[PDB]
Amino acid sequence: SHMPLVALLDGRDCTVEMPILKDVATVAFCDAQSTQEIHEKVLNEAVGALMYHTITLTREDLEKFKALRIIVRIGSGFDNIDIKSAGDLGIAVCNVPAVSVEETADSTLCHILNLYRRATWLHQALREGTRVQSVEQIREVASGAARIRGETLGIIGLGRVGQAVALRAKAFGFNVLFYDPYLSDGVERALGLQRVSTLQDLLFHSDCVTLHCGLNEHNHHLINDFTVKQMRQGAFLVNTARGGLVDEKALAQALKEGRIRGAALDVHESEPFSFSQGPLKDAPNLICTPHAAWYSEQASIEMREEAAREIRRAITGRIPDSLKNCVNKDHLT
Amino acid sequence: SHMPLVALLDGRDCTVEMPILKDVATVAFCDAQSTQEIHEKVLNEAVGALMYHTITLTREDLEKFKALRIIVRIGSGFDNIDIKSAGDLGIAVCNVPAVSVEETADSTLCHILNLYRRATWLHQALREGTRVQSVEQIREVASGAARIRGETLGIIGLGRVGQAVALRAKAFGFNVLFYDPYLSDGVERALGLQRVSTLQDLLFHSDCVTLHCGLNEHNHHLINDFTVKQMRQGAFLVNTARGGLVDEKALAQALKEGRIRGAALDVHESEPFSFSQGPLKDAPNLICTPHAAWYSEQASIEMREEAAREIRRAITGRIPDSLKNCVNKDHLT
Amino acid sequence: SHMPLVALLDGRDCTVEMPILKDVATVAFCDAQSTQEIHEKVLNEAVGALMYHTITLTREDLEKFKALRIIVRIGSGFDNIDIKSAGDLGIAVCNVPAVSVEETADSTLCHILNLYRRATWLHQALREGTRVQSVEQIREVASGAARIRGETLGIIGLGRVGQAVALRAKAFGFNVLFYDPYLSDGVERALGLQRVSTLQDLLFHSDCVTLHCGLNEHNHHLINDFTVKQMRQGAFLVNTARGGLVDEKALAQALKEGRIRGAALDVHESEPFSFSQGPLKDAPNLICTPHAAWYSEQASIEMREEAAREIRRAITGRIPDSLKNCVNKDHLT
Amino acid sequence: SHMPLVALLDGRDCTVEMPILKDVATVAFCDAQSTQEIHEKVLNEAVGALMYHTITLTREDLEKFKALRIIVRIGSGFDNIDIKSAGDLGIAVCNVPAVSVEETADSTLCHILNLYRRATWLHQALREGTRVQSVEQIREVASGAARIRGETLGIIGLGRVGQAVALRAKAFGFNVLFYDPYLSDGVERALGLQRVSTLQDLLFHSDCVTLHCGLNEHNHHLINDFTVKQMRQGAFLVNTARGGLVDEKALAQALKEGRIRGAALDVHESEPFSFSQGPLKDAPNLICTPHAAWYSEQASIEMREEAAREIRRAITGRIPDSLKNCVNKDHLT
Numbered sequence A, B, C, D: 001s002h003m004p005l006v007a008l009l010d011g012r013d014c015t016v017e018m019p020i021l022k023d024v025a026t027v028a029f030c031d032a033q034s035t036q037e038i039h040e041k042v043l044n045e046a047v048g049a050l051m052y053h054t055i056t057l058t059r060e061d062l063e064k065f066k067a068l069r070i071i072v073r074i075g076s077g078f079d080n081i082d083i084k085s086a087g088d089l090g091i092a093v094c095n096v097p098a099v100s101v102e103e104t105a106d107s108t109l110c111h112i113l114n115l116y117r118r119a120t121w122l123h124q125a126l127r128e129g130t131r132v133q134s135v136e137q138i139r140e141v142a143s144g145a146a147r148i149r150g151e152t153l154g155i156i157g158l159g160r161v162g163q164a165v166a167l168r169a170k171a172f173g174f175n176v177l178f179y180d181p182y183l184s185d186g187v188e189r190a191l192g193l194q195r196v197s198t199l200q201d202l203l204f205h206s207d208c209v210t211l212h213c214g215l216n217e218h219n220h221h222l223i224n225d226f227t228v229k230q231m232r233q234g235a236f237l238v239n240t241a242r243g244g245l246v247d248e249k250a251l252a253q254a255l256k257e258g259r260i261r262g263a264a265l266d267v268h269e270s271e272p273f274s275f276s277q278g279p280l281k282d283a284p285n286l287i288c289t290p291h292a293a294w295y296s297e298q299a300s301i302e303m304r305e306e307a308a309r310e311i312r313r314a315i316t317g318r319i320p321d322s323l324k325n326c327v328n329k330d331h332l333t
């Protein structure tokens, strides 16, 4: 009569998951931002866990769990989990990779166009009371807005979202390059894209750089004081991937010195983001959104339902064989 | 030794046009907002005129010119000129129809995505100090953001910009309908679009309505208290065409009552626009830009050079035969 | 109790049209190839006429009709009718312009690919008993097959079919140019195409030329001994438009001398076509189809139903106001 | 002063490879169709081997080599090599996966259109002397030609060529489904395609089935007497992948009984192909090409140069680390 315990770590709403797990697991929530806020009962008895991106699990955090057997990220990115240590400790880790692909690609294109077209900045100027009566004043307030056709969009990471961005970018006349050192040769041919071998080549030829790679152990601060200097003078930077990929120190100085004309960021090294704190406090030509590229009403539901099914498959079946999106089978023993 | 006089009515900068007209016409500027601000010398002696969109010419205004023989709009729209009366008075009217086509289509897609993705509103909330730490808070602050695929984009006016928008919209998964009662049947087939016969059908099936038609004598307040009721509950409205097409009274009430979830406007019934005056003073979910959809550094130059060449062709050749983009040959006698 | 007479000139099957015209007109057929084969009753009493492309009507032919008031081409092209003389004689002429647009564009792409890929010629070689065992033999039998990406496709006439071809050609990596001296500037921008001003420029830069213009009084033998010399050495020629546009004499010599590597023709100066007669008797690298680019089971029905409705509208309403696709309103008096 | 020996097994021309291997290896050719035709010197001393698709290497064949250390397929498919046994024997196997991707996709679209549009069959009828004078005769000779828009194209194997086909098929109005049980979920979203879970679903919903998967140990005769019955009545079949995927027995009967309206085959169970032998001797509505989907003058050179470089990398460096496209690293010991 005793069911396994499943805990929603960094959240409180479990409404979507309940119908799928009702007869399978007892569902509790922690609404926690760190391991220090998880009730002892959870650490001891929790067999499964659901979590988003607002809490990190190190080996130290993972070792506090005594019965945990699966973690499911409600989302694609799993950089916030020590995946290797989870496998060493016998904990399967899964993600939801497909739900918000096109939502994120559309958010990225929105930011790209918001830089080339300055719509968001033009709206601000009107909210601030700027009066734009003459054509000379239109040119002035819209200074920086550039023609898109002929421009080169450089994609770092041509996975699910990267490919979706590439196909959308082609519709506007962008010349699309991409850098992805983990794919085999020939993917550029199917999608009619141009490929480059190094990060330096990508930054050197791109008028607008957009990040679409996972954050792994080999690309933290991929955009740093060194690689920022490899970018075109007056280029754009867009990041809907992970904030850990950009050295905000180097980015702030680049915006201030005009080496980078503008930047649009949905993610940041330290989240939540605030224009009153951080290395970007006074950075100009900066657009930001609070890690919302993924969100739609349908997507939010679809990924929670998928994550709930993965939990069910783990409790009901054999780990890791019954799992559809386990991302650490190699490390699991 | 006496050259014809050409006047830039509603502007002052003539730098781009001078190299093309130096040996052909004397160039002066008026920097005028109305006919009342034009120097008497211009009204009497001006043979040609260059003007943007910030000044209107009625028959009353046109009759004040005693030597004018051609007007060239530096831009595509010529609704601000009494075209028929200009032809009656023997004045050719020309425009520049091709320069800013893709700039405007990209601005339109930016506004479309800014509504579906709420990037501009999410940026404001961060500037306003909103703190978005939990996923529940992300869902809250981004409430209204919707998935694009499957949504129906309704285009009113499938000309140069409309077709450019249609092709871009298809890349995001939009289902594209269009209404244009002046085209012959078969244009929908070449571009693979669906066509509807009436404005009511367009508004009835569209989740997002975008205007791309010229303002003529048969579509002022095309979007009015009556036709607004024919739109889907919670639909979007985008207008980069002409402000005279929308009854801002009806639009304000629709936004306030939630019948329309959001609106993005680059043009307005009375320009320049201000959030502190007009029927849209307190309208919610409203994005606005100061008639800047056309602008790029290249476009601004290209259209001024084309307009200068048209002037030259008129002074040097025979009106209207030597004109490339005369829009009132039928009325000219 | 007496109904008007409507005659299907160059056909016999009236099954599709009968349900639409039953209570409106008496329907007869002539199954005629020339005016000389039309029964006297038809010439005297026929008020309306339906015809395809296999019969020509000169002023001499038109003058033989004493009551005819409308002609409806079951199809888009109306070059086979003296349109001006028909208007002088008070005869409205209409067409069906939209039905087979995409069928024809798909046929054109089939011919284009059949030249670049030599599928049809490779099939023939297998039917002829050629044995292709080694790679060296594959290269030999497929000699001439070329990579498409980077190649330039030159479109002459960017109307309904031309635009449909252009959009399909872009999917294969073609660089698309077009020549159309009757369109206004700016259509190239909406569809992202490159435009040229003269026929010579089109032929000079194109690796594959495809015709998509109507046959009018200013382009008979548009491809002639002179303009053929303006084409690239080893270029392709495709014609799904009208045979009168090509001088088959010049074309045969070009194929024989290798100036043109191959040609695909759905239409010919004299139809029906036969490989045993005509200037193309012994021309090599020649593909031909019997004027079938338009045909699909749905298209054949759709255009006959549309043509029947046009007839009905003419008999029931006022000519030319009630007509949807009258192509000679200017000449009608 | 003694260099390693490299042999071109099933070919004779080594001109392209010589400049790359001149100072690295002695190059000989065998022009062999089977292992029985290879000179004893080659079997004993050959360190590297180059081969196309016209010779098969079993474990029995592989065991005859006493010094062979790498095989390089000049092409993508390596089904003609016992890959596992090659690894057991310490032989690295490599391929050239990217060269002819778009050539093959264009050949596939040519065959697809040749079925829907019957261009190749219409050309034959003209070569055979068929006279097509009336529209009724055009409909007759072109019977079977169908409208493409709305039709469903089912892709089996969405790799390099499959994705290239999918993007081209979308330009014609196809609804594209694909079946590929080896990809992870989410690839359909990036390319905007619909995905199905089983082969039966693919065949059940597809009007035209096109094969684009490698031939492996789990899909020989994937199209068989059983799965052919799961296809739509009157559907099309296209195969530019491998002939071993189709049971030509079942295919012949399907074409004869009309269950399949037509088939286009670039590959066959037994190659070379002949219309006078095999289960397809008398099959109707059959188009065939002699395994030429890959060929272009540029592609033929590019893959031979890549294959030569792979050989060089193997002789010069460390196997398998220095290899770019080794397809049997797992089996190599």
Ligand SMILES: NC(=O)C1=CN([C@@H]2O[C@H](COP(=O)(O)OP(=O)(O)OC[C@H]3O[C@@H](n4cnc5c(N)ncnc54)[C@H](O)[C@@H]3O)[C@@H](O)[C@H]2O)C=CC1
Pocket: A076, A077, A078, A097, A100, A101, A104, A156, A157, A158, A159, A160, A161, A162, A179, A180, A181, A182, A183, A212, A213, A214, A215, A216, A218, A219, A222, A240, A241, A242, A266, A267, A291, A292, A293, A294, A295
């Ligand atoms: N709201 C948001 O901000 C959202 C963010 N994301 C993030 O976007 C990123 C991409 O997601 P997906 O495309 O679904 O992942 P994916 O796994 O489909 O694609 C990742 C690609 O990046 C490439 N890559 C990895 N390291 C690289 C490097 N150093 N340089 C170049 N390429 C590299 C990989 O080869 C792979 O192809 C993820 O980090 C994910 O967390 C995803 C959805 C929403």
Ligand SMILES: NC(=O)C1=CN([C@@H]2O[C@H](COP(=O)(O)OP(=O)(O)OC[C@H]3O[C@@H](n4cnc5c(N)ncnc54)[C@H](O)[C@@H]3O)[C@@H](O)[C@H]2O)C=CC1
Pocket: B076, B077, B078, B097, B100, B101, B104, B156, B157, B158, B159, B160, B161, B162, B179, B180, B181, B182, B183, B212, B213, B214, B215, B216, B218, B219, B222, B240, B241, B242, B266, B267, B291, B292, B293, B294, B295
């Ligand atoms: N910065 C800005 O806000 C810019 C605004 N525009 C405006 O956008 C509009 C479109 O420009 P283009 O596409 O270049 O013009 P266009 O002449 O190429 O296309 C206009 C189309 O609208 C159609 N139309 C007219 N009245 C209509 C009605 N009542 N209902 C439906 N369709 C109707 C016409 O048939 C025509 O096809 C113009 O009014 C122009 O002034 C253009 C460029 C920049």
Ligand SMILES: NC(=O)C1=CN([C@@H]2O[C@H](COP(=O)(O)OP(=O)(O)OC[C@H]3O[C@@H](n4cnc5c(N)ncnc54)[C@H](O)[C@@H]3O)[C@@H](O)[C@H]2O)C=CC1
Pocket: C076, C077, C078, C097, C100, C101, C104, C156, C157, C158, C159, C160, C161, C162, C179, C180, C181, C182, C183, C212, C213, C214, C215, C216, C218, C219, C222, C240, C241, C242, C266, C267, C291, C292, C293, C294, C295
């Ligand atoms: N089975 C077949 O072979 C079929 C043939 N056709 C033919 O294809 C042709 C095109 O049809 P649509 O695109 O529907 O006609 P359309 O009227 O939509 O387009 C014709 C275009 O050709 C252009 N043009 C005319 N003369 C020209 C010249 N000398 N140089 C360059 N451009 C020129 C016009 O400006 C116009 O834009 C027609 O002649 C039609 O008869 C159409 C359908 C089926």
Ligand SMILES: NC(=O)C1=CN([C@@H]2O[C@H](COP(=O)(O)OP(=O)(O)OC[C@H]3O[C@@H](n4cnc5c(N)ncnc54)[C@H](O)[C@@H]3O)[C@@H](O)[C@H]2O)C=CC1
Pocket: D076, D077, D078, D097, D100, D101, D104, D156, D157, D158, D159, D160, D161, D162, D179, D180, D181, D182, D183, D212, D213, D214, D215, D216, D218, D219, D222, D240, D241, D242, D266, D267, D291, D292, D293, D294, D295
């Ligand atoms: N001249 C010719 O006929 C040419 C033939 N080919 C052939 O085309 C085929 C595809 O080549 P690429 O796309 O480059 O290979 P690829 O490795 O890029 O793609 C193969 C795809 O097929 C899928 N697949 C394998 N077995 C399957 C099954 N039973 N059901 C559904 N999907 C399955 C795999 O998951 C993979 O995604 C190969 O067999 C190759 O030999 C390639 C080039 C020229």
Ligand SMILES: [Cl-]
Pocket: A053, A075, A076, A077, A294
């Ligand atoms: Cl995320």
Ligand SMILES: [Cl-]
Pocket: A205
């Ligand atoms: Cl480059």
Ligand SMILES: [Cl-]
Pocket: B053, B075, B076, B077, B294
């Ligand atoms: Cl404007």
Ligand SMILES: [Cl-]
Pocket: B205
């Ligand atoms: Cl509908």
Ligand SMILES: [Cl-]
Pocket: C053, C075, C076, C077, C294
């Ligand atoms: Cl026709």
Ligand SMILES: [Cl-]
Pocket: C205
């Ligand atoms: Cl050029």
Ligand SMILES: [Cl-]
Pocket: D053, D075, D076, D077, D294
């Ligand atoms: Cl192959």
Ligand SMILES: [Cl-]
Pocket: D205
């Ligand atoms: Cl389905």
